[model samples]
Target: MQILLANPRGFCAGVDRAISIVENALAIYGAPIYVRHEVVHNRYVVDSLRERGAIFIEQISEVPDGAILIFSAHGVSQAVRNEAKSRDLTVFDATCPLVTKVHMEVARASRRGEESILIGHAGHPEVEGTMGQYSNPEGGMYLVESPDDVWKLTVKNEEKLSFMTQTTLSVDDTSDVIDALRKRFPKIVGPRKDDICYATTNRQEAVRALAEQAEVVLVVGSKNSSNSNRLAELAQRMGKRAFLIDDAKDIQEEWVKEVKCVGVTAGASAPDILVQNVVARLQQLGGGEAIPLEGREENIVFEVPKELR
Candidate 1:
């Protein structure tokens, strides 16, 4: 048996930055640092941080006054920010810069009298953050998750409208929805560059490459991870059996039957150690040789806030 590995698979810059922010804060501020939500939506990462005294909360109200609070990479709404401020909590904004860029775009477009349309899943923290940027009566943005959503949308100013998407979305899915929006409103504008993050695109591309050679693909990531789910879907879409597992323990014996070639890839939030652990388990099962399918070279890094430094 041969094990196919994916290069450029785990720990994208945003996830790295988010993790680093918490680590640095823990180092500088000592234990009991408060983080609002899972820093990056990975169970292992969250559990590891929790052991180090990071308190995860769903809302700012749960945090005590005067405590240090770190926003997750998923970003937060203005209401949440104001709530944190009202509590007088020391704030560390760990929102991914890519998501922050989208927020700025929406704010700028709205200020210039353009109607903004956001293409993202409803209730996602990032989507809520972006939408909150233009929640005032004078400025607003619409959410469209599918082609049907686009078809049903009614814009107040079709001529002066623009759109943006969540960074973690599947590239192929977003393209189809974008096509629907463009067809309905040819004048709809968007960002000068694609809003999808580079890591998400590269990981999905690597999964596609892995699917070509492997009969069964194992994605090492949390089930809630959007990019990880997309990688599994991409493999299945290509007619290869795929499973998204949080760890090696989730891999079932049935998935390996008649599967001589197995592909492994991790999500943006997944750690390299988890992938290595999965590989070790795969080797023990049948003693397969590992081969890497090379893809893009990633060197992106984001700096922590000056407070931590």
Candidate 2:
């Protein structure tokens, strides 16, 4: 069996900044720094940081007034931000700039009397954060997961419609939703470019290419990671058996018993070592004959907040 290592598989720029923000705050401010949510979806990463004195909390109220708190990379609601402000919490935001852009679009559409359709999974932190930006008491943003969801969607007015998406969605499936949106509501407006971020698009593209060349695909990421889940989803959709694993231990021997080429990749929030360890496991499973990683190189970088600097 041969192994195919994926290029551009882990640690996108935004993930780097989010993790670094936590590390910087912990070092500078000293222990017990509170983070509004999981800084990123990877548990290993979160646990490592927790050991360093970072506390993860879901609600703003959990954070003490005047204590340092960092927002997760998924972005947050104006309500959350305002609450943080009202508490006089010393703060640093780790929300990805890409996600913040989506929030802005929702605000712009809401102000213009548009009934916004958010094409994302319900209850995801990003979705929750994005949907909260629209405070239209008469009408708020509608969330949809698929083309069928779009079919049954009834906007406030066809002319007063707009759509945005979660950054880490299946590109091909998102197209289906958008197609349904336009076919159902021709007057709907949307962003100039699709809302899917560059990092998500690049990682998914690499997984897609590798899936065709391998008998099995393994995505290294936490279950909560949307982009990582999408990697496994894309491969399975392409008719290959793919599993999303947190590390080498999650790889079932039964799943790789007769595999020839094992394709391996990781989510953006996932660290490089997870990929390395999983690849080592693949090698032990008779995949030592390796194939060179062949894919686009990602050089995108996001800046941390000035306060952190």
Query: How far off is residue 96 in model 2, in Å?
Result: 0.4
Clashes of 2: 0
Q: lDDT by residue for model 2 over 1-309, one digit each (tens)?
A: 889977778998889999999999998899999998899999999999999999999999888777999999999998999899889789899999999989998998777766899999988999989998998766568999998888887866887788899999988989889989989999888976569999899988898889989889999999999999999999999999999999999989988998778899899989989888888888888888557677897777888777887
State in Å the error of residue 246, model 1. 0.7
Per-residue CA lDDT of model 1 for 215-267, tens digit only, reads: 99999988778888999999999999999999989888888866789999999
Per-prediction TM-score to the true structure, in the order listed:
0.97, 0.97
Full-model lDDT for every candidate: 0.89, 0.89
Question: Model 1, 287: alpha-carbon shift in Å?
Answer: 3.9
